[PDB]
Design a protein around this nucleic acid. Sequence first.
RNA 1: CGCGACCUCAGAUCAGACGUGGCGACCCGCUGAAUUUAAGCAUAUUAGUCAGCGGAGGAAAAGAAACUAACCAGGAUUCCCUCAGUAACGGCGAGUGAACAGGGAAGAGCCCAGCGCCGAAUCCCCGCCCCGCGGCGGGGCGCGGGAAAUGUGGCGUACGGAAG
Lengths: 158, 50, 53, 118, 86, 203, 122
Amino acid sequence: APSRNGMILKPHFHKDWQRRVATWFNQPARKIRRRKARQARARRIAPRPAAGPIRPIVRCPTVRYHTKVRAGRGFSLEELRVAGIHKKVARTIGISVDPRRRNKSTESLQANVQRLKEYRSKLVLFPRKPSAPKKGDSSAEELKLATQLTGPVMPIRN
Amino acid sequence: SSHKTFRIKRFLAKKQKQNRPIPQWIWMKTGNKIRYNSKRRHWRRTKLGL
Amino acid sequence: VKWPRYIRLQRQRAILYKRLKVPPAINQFTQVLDRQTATQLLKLAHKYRPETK
Amino acid sequence: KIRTSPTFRRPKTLRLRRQPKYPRKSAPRRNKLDHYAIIKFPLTTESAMKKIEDNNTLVFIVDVKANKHQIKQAVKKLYDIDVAKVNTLIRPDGEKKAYVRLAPDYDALDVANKIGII
Amino acid sequence: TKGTSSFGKRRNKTHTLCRRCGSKAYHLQKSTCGKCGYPAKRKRKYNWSAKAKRRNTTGTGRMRHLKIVYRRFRHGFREGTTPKPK
Amino acid sequence: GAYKYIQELWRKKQSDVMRFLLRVRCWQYRQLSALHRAPRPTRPDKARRLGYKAKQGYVIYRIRVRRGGRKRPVPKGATYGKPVHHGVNQLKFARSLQSVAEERAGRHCGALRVLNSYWVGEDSTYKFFEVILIDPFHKAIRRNPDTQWITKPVHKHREMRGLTSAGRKSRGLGKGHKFHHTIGGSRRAAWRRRNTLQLHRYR
Amino acid sequence: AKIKARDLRGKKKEELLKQLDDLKVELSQLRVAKVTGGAASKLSKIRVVRKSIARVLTVINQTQKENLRKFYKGKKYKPLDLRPKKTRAMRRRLNKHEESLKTKKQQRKERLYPLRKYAVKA
RNA sequence: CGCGACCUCAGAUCAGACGUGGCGACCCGCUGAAUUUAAGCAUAUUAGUCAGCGGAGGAAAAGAAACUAACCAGGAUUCCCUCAGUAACGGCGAGUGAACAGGGAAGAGCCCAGCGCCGAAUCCCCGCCCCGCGGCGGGGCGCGGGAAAUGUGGCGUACGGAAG
Ligand SMILES: [Mg+2]
Ligand SMILES: [Mg+2]
Ligand SMILES: [Mg+2]
Ligand SMILES: [Mg+2]
Ligand SMILES: [Mg+2]
Ligand SMILES: [Mg+2]
Ligand SMILES: [Mg+2]
Ligand SMILES: [Mg+2]
Ligand SMILES: [Mg+2]
Ligand SMILES: [Mg+2]
Ligand SMILES: [Mg+2]
Ligand SMILES: [Mg+2]
Ligand SMILES: [Mg+2]
Ligand SMILES: [Mg+2]
Ligand SMILES: [Mg+2]
Ligand SMILES: [Mg+2]
Ligand SMILES: [Mg+2]
Ligand SMILES: [Mg+2]
Ligand SMILES: [Mg+2]
Ligand SMILES: [Mg+2]
Ligand SMILES: [Mg+2]
Ligand SMILES: [Mg+2]
Ligand SMILES: [Mg+2]
Ligand SMILES: [Mg+2]
Ligand SMILES: [Mg+2]
Ligand SMILES: [Zn+2]
């Protein structure tokens, strides 16, 4: 029974919605739950980055967004085989991999290749048993000054 | 029904033992809120089920 | 006699393999090697048996 | 061979005995209804004392899983007196009253003075 | 004789006590219980009566096994040990 | 290997070799009862590619679902309701007869767990499915790491939650734009995210 | 006097059953004294002898079942009373060996490609 | 006729195991209305909802593309903000109504059958000895019994892979 002037509208309340209403009163309890879990995870992987692995330079898909570069899913196999990092060793030393990515361009591939080689120049890899280092381990001086870095490892800005 | 079965007669035995009143040494206790046996049952008034 | 149902079905399955037009790809297995050649082949084959455990 | 009857019967097979590699429960159950828990006490009513005085019986109450045989075995083991017969009933309270008529060489007034009821 | 003089003929009963629910609802002629459905393997339970669910669920009776399994869970189901004596 | 040959053979079904085979098999299975143990699979390649590794602990049943649609189990005509909901004769059931087959076989064996299931034969009035069951308390299963997943309590009665291939094909899920009405866990999880108010604290 | 369950464990079996028989006899005499109408001392005492019955039977059943389980200690099929009676799903759980044993695929993967111990310079 | 192999199929108070039933707030599968709204009502709406039935777990389900896109392309699932009350459905009436892309929470990937190649290289069970034994496991011994060639194990799975 509409009155004089005003938007005619269709509120979607014709179902029985009061038996199903998700109320957000555990919002701050859920945030403190998540950040206590995040602190526990970040101190149980003790020198490793808390943000997890490194994730590649990726341009957004569609016409609205292709001028913005965001962090992707994982490094593709082609830029891994150009950077000389082995497929199964990349995620075990901290480089995220998805094989599903193509590389139709060349300069984005070389940007990811340079980004991987920058990561391998930057990381400090500990020897597996501390009493006996091997050839692919960092020096015991920079082992002393290794620490976590907060936030995403090598932040990606356009 | 003087042809009772055993389960019925046992059930009646339990309710006949429950029908006795309160023992009078209780209402001198400390945390007592009991004054008489409320769950009593007269055989004319309530017919027990069964 | 009134046989059990498994004896009845396993005989009249053979009766159906005699009744129906068996295609030649299944017919070729009943045209079988005869006994005085088969015992020849088996006394040859008994020499090259694979090893017991 | 030959079949005579036109009905196929099941061939009677061999069935072995139970040879269990371990017992199910380890200890056998201790007899919870024994000669002390079978009779609880005797009665001291005026009818019960008049019956032990005259009819040479005893008046006990027992738990309801008894037998007449179990009651007479119990009295023969507990008071060393021979029992002629046993009459059991279930009282409206629910216990099983038993009437233990003795052998005539024993006297139940002497047994009652022996076991305390007077 | 629809009423008072037909209430006199009520002398042979229909229901009696069941052996699973204990209520007087075991029918004699059908021989199935009314509240629990005795010869059925499963407890008669419907969601159109939350009150008939609340009258006998896990919290109602003695919980002879299940309060014990609660206090065993709160130490994590230890067995075979006794505390060291004095 | 032979299994490529016999799988091409089973793909050629109107060939009269296979027509004779599945007609005689379908006769034998029609004669035999509704739920009996097959001792070994009729189709070993499809058994193996569905998961039957022929060792101790896997059994195979051969069950007969009665073929047809589903008329509405309602008294004589009489669906008491509006005229959209009158019709009872031409209604069809949401799950495939393969899923009904593995369902009632996994019901009849409560101790065993449905791995998958496959087809063996059909006539006008029945269809026949051989369903693979795993005994999860047998130790050739339990000590094998890549198949001790079936021995966990979450995989209890897969055929009735609808987690096998035949139950999976009737829940309407999978990646795509074709399956928008199931994203979330399932169809009802889709419905349940969609039809709730998220009343925030600050609105 | 005050019977207790540290004075009963080195006691041998037949004199424990003799002690049990004497306590049963004393309980029966006290029940006859109850129904006849005895002293308040005896009406007190029947709880003492019921708990005396109780802890003698406790000592008997404990020393029986301990001997049973150190008889069935080394054996492989021990009875259902003597097996671990934890919850049903926790008995039907996979054991500490079968949840631990890994296939050769993933154990050679865990050999060749282990998780390393890395840290990224800022 | 008998004896013996196998194939189908029975019987066991056989040896060892296993399922049943309960609760059901959250989860999964099926079934599934009508009051109500349309100022009537029949399609629609209520509603894949209440009722019913089966089945679980500490979470379930989902999940590592037979995908989204059409761009300088993204990249398992799940959840939140947003897309949006939009595209769209609807006696186009009342009403219904997603998804992509973006930002976040979290982040982990893998394995068979087939193709093959290795003297079945594989597994279960009994007996004896040693160790540990309240998650019945480790080692040796067996001219001990079975399973398995109608195919177990090792390598190997779409990111290719194997051999030389
Ligand atoms: Mg107005
Ligand atoms: Mg009256
Ligand atoms: Mg009647
Ligand atoms: Mg029910
Ligand atoms: Mg309609
Ligand atoms: Mg799954
Ligand atoms: Mg389909
Ligand atoms: Mg493998
Ligand atoms: Mg047995
Ligand atoms: Mg259940
Ligand atoms: Mg209307
Ligand atoms: Mg109106
Ligand atoms: Mg109207
Ligand atoms: Mg609808
Ligand atoms: Mg709708
Ligand atoms: Mg419901
Ligand atoms: Mg549980
Ligand atoms: Mg899961
Ligand atoms: Mg894939
Ligand atoms: Mg996505
Ligand atoms: Mg808007
Ligand atoms: Mg119109
Ligand atoms: Mg998106
Ligand atoms: Mg983050
Ligand atoms: Mg192989
Ligand atoms: Zn009942």
